[PDB]
Write a protein that binds this ligand. Structure first.
Ligand SMILES: CN(C)C(=O)CCN(C(=O)[C@@H]1CCCN1C(=O)[C@@H](NC(=O)c1cc2cc(C(F)(F)P(=O)(O)O)ccc2s1)C(C)(C)C)c1ccc(Br)cc1
Length: 555
């Protein structure tokens, strides 16, 4: 809460200086109002002379009014300069608080909001949750409360100058203040239309999906009065670039969305103005690989603040989505999305990503997604990272630090196949998460699957162990396969690599049941016995009702 306390201090100073300008604005209006009354007195003074007639009294009444006329005329002249001075002083104070406001806004919007948004982007790859927008709304409320007060303050100060003009520096001073105000409100309004909950980045046609679009300055401006409509629209990466550059053909889009319209709702209790699209669906998609084609859901809205004097057109784009029609296309779709959420640079043109990235950056991305997919805190160890670097780079080294300067290209990750294989690194890696996720989630968590060791590594671990000591390994030759490697002293071969099982095999008999059937397996690596690790998962054979068993019995 270091920068958090400085943000709060600046907000508190901003409200104190805005009350000062308000006090001085009412004071200026009083000064001007009295000056207008004193000016009428100087008019009555001449009308008093006009009511002339005997110079025995008319010589004394003429001198009384002359002395009075002069003093009031002198007071008026001095008060006019005071009116101009206090006016300049107010504009200077408004210019000062607006410059401070600009700095305070840049902090909330270009830093804290971007950090929240990035936190949300990385959460797509199974990263840590971004958290509630409560803090960001609390600040955007104050930003709006303050810019709106100063705006109405200057509109009032301007009204005074209309009713009593005094030419000088004040005109261009107010022209500057106004330009600053439109810049700040436009920025505050356009930037605070954000997507609280993103749509699915791997989207299947004809599948119900949801999104949430919040407006952080909803409660503090006159926006909830007429809650605006938001129109969800699916567009392509090219269409997204031209939408930003403004070189578009108005309604250019790439498909229909069912229930693509929603009206923002204000929740008094929380102060939130937000469109909840709960029943969206992709009816059709226009496509000019399918897997590498990035789309985005564009949310538009049009609304005003206070009166039709201030109207805005807001547009927010979702994180890139990949559309799949089969479901079987998910394998490679996840890879392009995984790359996007991880390696996207801030302030990029629509869905631009780096061609190559350094190996430890890709390590973060794989570890993050891996833990999320298997639903465990046991991630990829330093040894596991080396195993994958050996596989990926086709390098011998067993030192993670060696790979640190190397670069994985997109084609090296999920386009060109591995050395002697018919699959890519992503296909191999995703294959492992997929077999681990469907089944073996508790097994992976309980450490029973060592997995990321090559055929040689497993032998150079099991040799010095008793007959029947095994380890569970990931097959190289078969995507999503698990191989049992075990040492058992015998003629011309001591280490044994059993045939790899895939999800089809597990669907017939579980990993635990299959291990329990094989008597030649007795000790899971390193010491712990087989039944000690898999007794939990052996199937208690249940009697069938068809065989005449009225109550559930365990044979
Ligand atoms: C109760 N019961 C019937 C059973 O399930 C147990 C019986 N069983 C077997 O013993 C089968 C029966 C046929 C030959 N067999 C073998 O295991 C023979 N082994 C292999 O044939 C192979 C070993 C590797 C290693 C790899 C590798 F190293 F992991 P990779 O890194 O290159 O991918 C890649 C392919 C292969 S093929 C063996 C020489 C050990 C006898 C079994 C049956 C079916 C399935 Br599927 C799985 C195992």
């Amino acid at each position: 809460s270091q920068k958090h306390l400085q943000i709060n201090q600046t907000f508190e100073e901003l409200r104190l200086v805005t009350q000062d300008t308000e006090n001085e604005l009412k004071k200026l209006q009083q000064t001007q109002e009295y000056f207008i009354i004193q000016y009428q007195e100087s008019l009555r003074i001449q009308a008093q002379f006009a009511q002339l007639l005997s110079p025995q009294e008319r010589l004394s009444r003429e001198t009384a009014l002359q002395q009075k006329q002069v003093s009031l005329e002198a007071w008026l002249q001095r008060e006019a300069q005071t009116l101009q001075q206090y006016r300049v002083e107010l504009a200077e104070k408004h210019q000062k608080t607006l410059q401070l406001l600009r700095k305070q806004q840049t902090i909330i919007l270009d830093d804290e909001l971007i950090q929240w948004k990035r936190r949300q982007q990385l959460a797509g790859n199974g990263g840590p949750p971004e958290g509630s927008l409560d803090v960001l709304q609390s600040w955007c409320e104050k930003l709006a409360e303050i810019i709106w007060q100063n705006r109405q303050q200057i509109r009032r100060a301007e009204h005074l100058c209309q009713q009593l003009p005094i030419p000088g520096p004040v005109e261009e001073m107010l022209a500057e203040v106004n330009a600053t105000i439109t810049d700040i409100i436009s920025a505050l309004v356009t930037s605070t239309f954000i997507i609280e909950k993103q749509p699915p980045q791997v989207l299947k046609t004809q599948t119900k999906f949801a999104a949430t679009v919040r407006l952080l300055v909803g409660g503090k401006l006159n926006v909830h009065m007429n809650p605006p409509q938001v129109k969800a629209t699916i567009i392509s990466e090219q269409q997204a670039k031209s939408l930003l550059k403004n070189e578009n053909t108005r309604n250019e889009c790439s498909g229909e969305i069912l229930n693509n319209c929603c009206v923002m709702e204000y929740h008094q209790a929380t102060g939130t103005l937000s469109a909840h699209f709960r029943n969206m669906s992709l009816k059709r998609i226009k496509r000019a690989s399918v897997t590498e084609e990035k789309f985005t859901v564009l949310f538009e809205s049009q609304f005003s603040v206070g009166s039709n004097e201030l109207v805005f057109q807001v547009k927010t784009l979702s994180l890139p989505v990949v559309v799949i029609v089969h479901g079987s296309q998910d394998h490679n779709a996840t890879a392009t999305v995984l790359w996007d959420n991880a390696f996207a640079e801030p302030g990029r043109v629509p869905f631009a990503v780096p061609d190559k990235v350094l190996w430890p950056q890709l390590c973060e991305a794989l570890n993050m997604k891996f833990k999320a997919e298997v639903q465990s805190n046991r991630g990829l160890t330093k040894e596991n990272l080396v195993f994958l670097a050996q596989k990926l780079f086709n390098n011998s080294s067993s030192h993670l630090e060696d790979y640190s300067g190397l670069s994985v290209s997109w084609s090296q990750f999920n386009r060109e196949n591995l050395p002697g294989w018919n699959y890519t690194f992503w296909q191999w890696f995703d294959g492992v998460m997929e077999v681990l996720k469907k089944h073996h989630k508790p097994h992976w968590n309980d450490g029973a699957i060592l997995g990321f060791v090559n055929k040689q590594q497993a032998h150079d671990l099991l040799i010095n162990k008793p007959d029947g000591t095994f380890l569970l390994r990931f097959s190289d030759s078969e995507i999503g396969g698990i191989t049992i490697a075990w040492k058992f002293d015998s003629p011309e071969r001591n280490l044994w690599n059993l045939k790899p099982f895939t999800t089809r095999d597990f669907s017939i008999r579980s990993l635990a049941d299959r291990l329990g059937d094989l008597s030649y397996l007795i000790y899971v690596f390193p010491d712990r016995p087989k039944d000690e690790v898999f007794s939990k998962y052996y199937t208690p054979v249940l009697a069938k009702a068809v065989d005449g068993y009225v109550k559930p019995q365990i044979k």
